[PDB]
UniProtKB/Swiss-Prot annotation, chains A, B:
It is an enzyme of class 3 (hydrolase). Changing H437Q: Loss of activity. Its EC number is 3.1.1.7. It catalyses: acetylcholine + H2O = choline + acetate + H(+). This is Acetylcholinesterase. The active site is at S197 (acyl-ester intermediate), E324 (charge relay system), H437 (charge relay system). The gene is ache. Belongs to the type-B carboxylesterase/lipase family. Inhibited by substrate concentrations above 0.5 mM. The keyword Nucleotide-binding does not apply.
Amino acid sequence: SELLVNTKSGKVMGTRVPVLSSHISAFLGIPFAEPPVGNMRFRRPEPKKPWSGVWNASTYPNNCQQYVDEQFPGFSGSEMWNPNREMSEDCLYLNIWVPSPRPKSTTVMVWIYGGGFYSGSSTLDVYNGKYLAYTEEVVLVSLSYRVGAFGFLALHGSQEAPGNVGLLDQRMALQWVHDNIQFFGGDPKTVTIFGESAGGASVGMHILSPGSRDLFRRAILQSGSPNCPWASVSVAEGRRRAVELGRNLNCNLNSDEELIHCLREKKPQELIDVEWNVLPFDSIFRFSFVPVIDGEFFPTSLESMLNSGNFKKTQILLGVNKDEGSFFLLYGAPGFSKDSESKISREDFMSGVKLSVPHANDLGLDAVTLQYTDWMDDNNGIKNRDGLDDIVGDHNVICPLMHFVNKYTKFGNGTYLYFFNHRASNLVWPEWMGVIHGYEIEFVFGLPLVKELNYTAEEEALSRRIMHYWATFAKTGNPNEPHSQESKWPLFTTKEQKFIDLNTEPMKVHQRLRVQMCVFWNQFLPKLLNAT
Amino acid sequence: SELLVNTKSGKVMGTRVPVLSSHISAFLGIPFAEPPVGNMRFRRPEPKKPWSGVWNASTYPNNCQQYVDEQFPGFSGSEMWNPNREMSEDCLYLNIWVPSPRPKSTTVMVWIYGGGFYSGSSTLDVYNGKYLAYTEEVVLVSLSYRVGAFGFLALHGSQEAPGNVGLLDQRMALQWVHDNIQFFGGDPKTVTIFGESAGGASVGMHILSPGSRDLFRRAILQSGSPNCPWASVSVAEGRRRAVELGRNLNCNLNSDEELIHCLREKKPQELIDVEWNVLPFDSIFRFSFVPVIDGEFFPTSLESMLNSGNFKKTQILLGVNKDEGSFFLLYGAPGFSKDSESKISREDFMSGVKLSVPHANDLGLDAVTLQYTDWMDDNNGIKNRDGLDDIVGDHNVICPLMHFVNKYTKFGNGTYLYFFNHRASNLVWPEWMGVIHGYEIEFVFGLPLVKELNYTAEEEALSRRIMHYWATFAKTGNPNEPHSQESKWPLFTTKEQKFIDLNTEPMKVHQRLRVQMCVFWNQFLPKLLNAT
């Protein structure tokens, strides 16, 4: 049967699903690890024990335990990101979409969801891999991994909560793909991992980590890189946050043994209710439990690894959205509201700057403010709002990705860069937010191809171009068709630094994406904070 | 006789001079102080002893001893600034141009020449006051003062070389004007002092200094303010430079008495030949012997005086030229040449930055470089050249003047600001230098009205407008004609900060002259250098 597959872990029974008036196979909720429950909470994952009989993979699995956004009850804009399945610590499963008839050895794409390392689900409507699997004829895989304290609590030195276990969950899923995707028609030697935000940072982390490198061929990073200021912390800060978490739950803090044991007795929602109380600063775009530079998953500092070429050398495709920061300002900066133009005063602008660059001394805050203020029109509400939006995006997403791309390209085998600046016609978020963080995802997964979702014809065409760029890159290492007549996406080189815009207009090539600001954030500011 | 005037110091015999096919009286070389020679070198000036008989004031006096620019022998561009009379330490004289018939009580304008406090003459062709005296019907006075070590050697604590004696020379000349200009037809209660560069800085210094304030009514500052980074030094740096001067001439350095005595035995050219060897840094736009914050001429720091309103409150008219810095780059920065486009490389750009902001640590140099570099086109020779030109001008002239105007306007009785951006059609300097430091002077003194000098008709018209603005301001405290139909030069206020451009085009009003850069130079950079 087309829906029956015998893997090395046991037999699996999938289901046939309709897609654009056709059909493909779907294998949902395939376990790739032992449920990290009880004494296993905080521990590295263990392989799923083989099973006899047939595993019923016709329905989505549970979502990992996580914080749930309730800032806008009912609102589809925010709820489309919340878990759509029951949450459970038993959540290490993966999903596979296979073309029909089943391929013999086709290109594989493994999606790693984002969510700031504190949230995310592989089962969201926006991540339905059936469209992309069907349209581009690829085996689409989406995995899951522990988030929040459950996946990143780090007490370096102990084996009970070493940290980075969430990344190890991802690696384990990749290991399963490498060992079993051949039975689903996938070519294990041609797997492209791709992700957005924390997922994009994760992809970059597997490129850097020696233990993950041999598990995939190519990579795509969307609005996220390993070196982002929010993507990782030192073992010292990790330890400090783990202890403070224990303090919020009145735990015995005399030893790691004591702390860990007390934390394992807590219900999941108990850790979640106090998770945000451990941040060191009043801030925006900063998360509690994230990856840690431990000396194991990451041999040394990320900067020294990038400088020495200590990473997987292959082809990469990556880029960012025009307005990465608006989302975090809406939720945490004074002056911003979902239902108003959010024109910001001078007062709130500087309040916003302090929140965006929490680690900065006064000289630093002044440098940022001077860099993003137009002194010929400083009380212009729209300029201050957009200035703040740019700060959050440049500091947290764009400038760190540009640092990565430039460092990577010196040792890589091919880089392709994009700048997504199309605002979807059916967006429910206000206009001032622009091309929002995470909204390029729907074009990558091809939602615009479904008439009932209400996109325009140019947005459907844009989605097909993007799906074809992503899949062609996954297959060949080049997003362009060999003998095509279409416009060519130039290769990003150390010298020209070319990139393209991604919208419904005729392709335009540019150079040095936001260089002026990137030099400020990557060269000047760090130098200033270190000297003062 | 129209040419005979009986002053309180004695009788003076002037001469009749032709001007634009008419005539006016000129009294040249009137002594206002005892010759500061011998034991008087470095000392405060003493009033000229009254004389019997008639003083022959028909010819220009000598020019003070000074460094003479020989970088371009023969070249009119540079030689028009060199002394055109024999140099002599006996040089404290003033010149007066009086309309004919002699006025009864008309507006007086006293010109104070610039020259970085190390050079300058009241007898240059560009300073011929006959045109302005004739055209606007005012009594025009040009004074002289000691420059270089002769006027600013400062060994605070001793009365033999206290410092600031050059400023005291100016004050003494102003005292003579106050006491005698009535005999030449001038109104001593309506005197406007005006000057350019060091002369503009001098004017600002008399506004600040308690002992000079009662000697004039209004003031005009052209491309120079008291708070310029090159216009003054601490008593400590003054002392250090005086000692180093003595060291270059192998003087006894055991005591001030010893040093001063040894310096007084040296021929004038001997001090001049080593004057430039005492600068603390390798630099551009920095001069050896300049005014010193002594606690006498200047009660306290200039910044505290400006903040507390400790200065003469009256009306002021001031402004700057578009390209103040090009002159200093041509003479001292690598890559610039008089006969080439001077396109600058990245190498020489940063070399130039180090020379322009000599007091800056590495973090500071990086701040400046980032502030003036276009990273989308960093190897553009023309952008680097112009960037450097702007740095020198903004740091040394424009930003310090804007700080002054903004501080002054809070306590003053009326401010008028201009931005001179017209490049004379007959300039002999290369095009890349633009609207050069000091070239607005010729329009103020009305040289364009003389056909034989080869200016265009629009430049003659521009000169008349400027002469009329300056003189009307001198008379009324407002450059505009009460019931005129011409465009109005708005008043600069703390709120609007309006200013006008000065060229041959229809008047255009603007706001916040180079604010972006001024905030960098007046608020940010100083904060950075003080914290690091």
